[PDB]
Amino acid sequence: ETKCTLKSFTVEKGIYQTSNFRVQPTESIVRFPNITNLCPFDEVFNAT
Amino acid sequence: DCTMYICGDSTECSNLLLQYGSFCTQLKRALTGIAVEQDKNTQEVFAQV
Numbered sequence: 001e002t003k004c005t006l007k008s009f010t011v012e013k014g015i016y017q018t019s020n021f022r023v024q025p026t027e028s029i030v031r032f033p034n035i036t037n038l039c040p041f042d043e044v045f046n047a048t
Numbered sequence: 049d050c051t052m053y054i055c056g057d058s059t060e061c062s063n064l065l066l067q068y069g070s071f072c073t074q075l076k077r078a079l080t081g082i083a084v085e086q087d088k089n090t091q092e093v094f095a096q097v
Contacts, residue, residue, distance in 0.1 A: 017076070017080070020049050020052060022052075022057070
């Protein structure tokens, strides 16, 4: 990794930085209202 | 860091950013030089014995 970062094949002694590390998400979620409201269609189709 | 600041957690944003490339590499080199000189200042001032 440090050879890749410095863009060479030989590196002298010392400390070298590189790309950061970041935790990827385990999975995915989606959220949306609750949702209580319902259009009154059971009354519509039971109309006498 | 380049990507974390500019294109945070966005793979395609990093893909586009890769076109510039060496730009932020120069930034990292400059800041690292600044930090090393910062340490050297104290080393020079206090360590004369």
